[PDB]
């Protein structure tokens, strides 16, 4: 059922957990570094878990997709063929920016954080800077122990702060991926949909130095020996059975003003969806004719597809439940309730007015702000601006450097510059530059940027072509040239004739000004947001509703039971799918082109010892009433005894609007059954070495 519960809320969900069928003790789940919770790890935007004492990690294929793609070429395309390392020495690097974060410690720093903010006084920009300085110092201190990366989280609009410390594993390797037609069976047609028949799994191995301590990739590294790892269920999961997930959901907006919902539904989602679908169309068309573009842009395209479809589904779910009307009426109820409390309601009413003004300020420049950010996110302009900004930050003392540009960020910056080599083709990026130039040019005069207008020197198709031809002279297309500029100083950027560098130098003062506006608004938000959101929490509790913070990339638990849902009268979706449903969808054309060994094995009824007699087949995917969102992909699903019964990977179509208004009847998790992972690894794309390592072969 509903709720992305923080670990600190275990006392309040202990009852409900038991009633839903958890047979582990709650104290046993309270130990975040114990068995089984200490097996659960963050990947940075996905979740994973250890499944062996020798550092084997299981996550979704969608989570490993970037890594698989980094190791793919048009000639040897692992997205298409799968990957399998018969021995650990055959594992390939997942990329310099791949990470496994292992939870070490959580600390409440709410009192200190809020005192740092208060000490800033009246000024909005100082208030941002005070919190930043607080955060940097705290993190520096936490990260004094080598091998650890720390993160400060704000919950419930700034009403609580906790610091997380994680062991940061920095040499993550790909151990196994099923073929794409298993890992992403049904592609974007079945994305966000049930019935689902997708084997969405892959494995990494975590590596450390011979001294036990995290290190970047080296042939001298050895597998990490985790303290805890998960075991596969020995009991067959069935309909109605208890399941729980622990993971790292990214963001939800269930506490939001009506107007923030309205702007998102009316402007933000449709705008992004359109821009993404436009770029998908260009890249798809180009990749049809160029297999190198197809493979190099596959991960970006997966992202654009997944997001745009998610947004389409949100817009549709808003209309289905009247989200606009729900938000309007809830807000009128909270505002009435506050007005009813006389004096002591006033600070929240005032906060609400301030929040609404800050939203309006945002809105006045939204087209400009989005368009410029996304133009600057093409590969060469993104490289140029990031590296020119680093050269500026490098002249300040480290503690004063912008977050993202401190010494502790240098590995990521550098690794990103290298990864891009497998994700850039000039003739493709040019078309993307051109798209964004044409969108920039449609902005009205009051949403234009002087710097970009001057640089363009014109407002028509000719000026666009002349600018593209100028940018094509960049030398940032090569990894070595980017790394040169990664180390160069500010003066070297300002003397350069590279046309992408010249763009960056020309626009940088404008980006820096926009950033200060954003920091200023954020500082006002620091004042207003916690007061209003506490009012919202207090009102929800007076209504007897569940109270838990919006997602914010920190660890949460959700729990419930295996069950289907009813999308309309006269029909029900069943909780499971089966092997014969996979074959029934076969067309022999992407995305419905399963491996021939799959089609053979199902035809021969080779169930591999994994049949669930209650469904007459091996289960493939299942529905449950858990509350998950983006960032939960890869989260283990545990049964009543804390055994692995699947991985979380998607939501059904009607669920996605729950980011803004929670609908219990149509909100489900889609997970891939542990038995299907094992079945694929036995009958279809064999990995007997891994099955043995996990004690299931």
């Amino acid at each position: 059922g509903e709720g992305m519960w923080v670990p600190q809320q275990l006392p309040e969900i202990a009852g409900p957990l038991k009633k839903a069928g958890l047979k582990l003790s709650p104290q046993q789940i309270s130990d975040l570094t114990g068995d089984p919770m200490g097996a659960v790890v963050a990947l940075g935007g996905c979740t994973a878990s250890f499944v062996s004492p020798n550092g084997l990690v299981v996550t979704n294929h969608a989570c490993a997709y970037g890594a698989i793609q980094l190791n793919s070429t048009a000639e040897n395309n692992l997205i298409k063929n799968g990957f399998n390392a018969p021995t650990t020495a055959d594992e390939v690097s997942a990329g310099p920016n791949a990470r496994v974060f292992v939870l070490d410690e959580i600390t409440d720093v709410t009192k200190d954080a809020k005192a740092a903010i208060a000490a800033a006084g009246d000024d909005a920009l100082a208030r941002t800077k005070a919190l930043e300085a607080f955060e940097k110092k705290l993190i520096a201190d936490c990260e004094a122990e080598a091998g650890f990366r720390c993160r400060l989280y704000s919950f419930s609009g700034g009403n609580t702060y906790r610091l997380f410390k994680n062991l940061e594993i920095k040499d993550v390797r790909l151990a196994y991926a099923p073929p794409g037609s298993v890992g992403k069976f049904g592609g974007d047609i079945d994305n966000w949909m049930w019935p689902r028949h997708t084997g969405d799994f892959a494995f990494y191995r975590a590596y450390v130095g011979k001294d036990g301590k995290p290190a970047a990739f080296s042939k001298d590294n050895v597998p990490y020996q985790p303290k805890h790892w998960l075991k596969f269920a020995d009991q067959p999961l069935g309909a109605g059975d208890f399941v729980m997930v622990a993971g790292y959901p990214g963001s939800t907006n269930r506490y939001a003003l009506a107007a923030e919902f309205d702007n998102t539904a009316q402007w933000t989602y449709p705008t992004i969806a359109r821009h993404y679908k436009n770029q998908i169309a260009m890249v798809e068309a180009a990749g049809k004719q160029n297999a190198d573009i197809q493979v190099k842009y596959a991960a970006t395209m997966a992202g654009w597809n997944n997001t745009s479809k998610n947004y389409d589904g949100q817009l549709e779910g808003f209309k289905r439940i009247d989200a606009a009307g729900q938000k309007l009426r809830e807000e009128a109820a909270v505002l009435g309730w506050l007005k009813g409390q006389g004096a002591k309601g006033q600070p929240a009413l005032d906060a609400h007015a301030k929040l609404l003004d800050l939203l309006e300020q945002s809105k006045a420049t939204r087209d400009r702000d989005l368009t410029l950010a996304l133009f600057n996110n093409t590969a060469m302009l993104g490289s140029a601006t990031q590296l020119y900004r680093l050269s500026i930050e490098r002249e300040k003392p480290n503690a004063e450097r912008e977050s993202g540009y401190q010494e502790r960020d240098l590995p990521a910056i550098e690794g990103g510059l290298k990864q891009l080599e497998r994700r850039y083709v000039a003739a493709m990026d040019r078309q993307l530059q051109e798209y964004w130039l044409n969108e920039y040019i449609k902005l009205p005069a009051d949403q234009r940027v002087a710097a970009v207008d001057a640089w363009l020197g014109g407002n028509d198709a000719a000026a666009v072509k002349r600018a593209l031809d100028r940018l094509a002279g960049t030398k940032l297309g090569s990894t070595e040239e980017r790394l040169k500029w990664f180390a160069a100083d500010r003066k070297a950027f300002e003397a350069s004739n590279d046309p992408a560098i010249q763009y960056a130098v020309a626009v940088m003062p404008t980006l820096l000004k926009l950033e200060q506006e954003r920091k200023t608004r954020a500082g006002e938000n620091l004042a207003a947001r916690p007061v209003y959101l506490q009012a919202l929490a207090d009102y929800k509790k007076s209504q007897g509703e569940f109270v838990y913070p919006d997602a914010n990339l920190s660890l949460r638990i959700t729990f419930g039971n295996v069950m289907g849902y009813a999308p309309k009268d006269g029909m029900e979706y069943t909780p499971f799918t089966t092997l014969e449903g996979v074959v029934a969808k076969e067309t022999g054309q992407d995305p419905f082109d399963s491996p021939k060994a799959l089609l053979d094995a199902v035809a021969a009824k080779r169930y591999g010892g994994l049949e669930d007699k209650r469904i007459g087949s091996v289960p493939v995917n299942y529905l449950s009433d858990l509350d998950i969102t983006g960032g939960n992909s890869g989260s283990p699903v545990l049964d009543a005894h804390g055994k692995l019964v699947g991985l979380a990977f998607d939501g059904n179509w009607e669920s996605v609007s729950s980011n803004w208004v929670f609908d219990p009847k149509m909100t489900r998790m889609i997970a891939v059954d542990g038995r299907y992972l094992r079945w694929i690894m036995q009958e279809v794309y064999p990995a007997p070495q891994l099955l043995k390592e996990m004690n299931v072969g």
Binding site: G45, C46, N60, A62, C63, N191, W192, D200, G250, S251, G303, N306, T307, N310, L553, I628, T629, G630, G631, N632, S633, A648, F649, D650, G651
Partner: peptide
């Protein structure tokens, strides 16, 4: 898919 965009 519930990856984080």
């Amino acid at each position: 898919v519930y990856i984080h965009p």
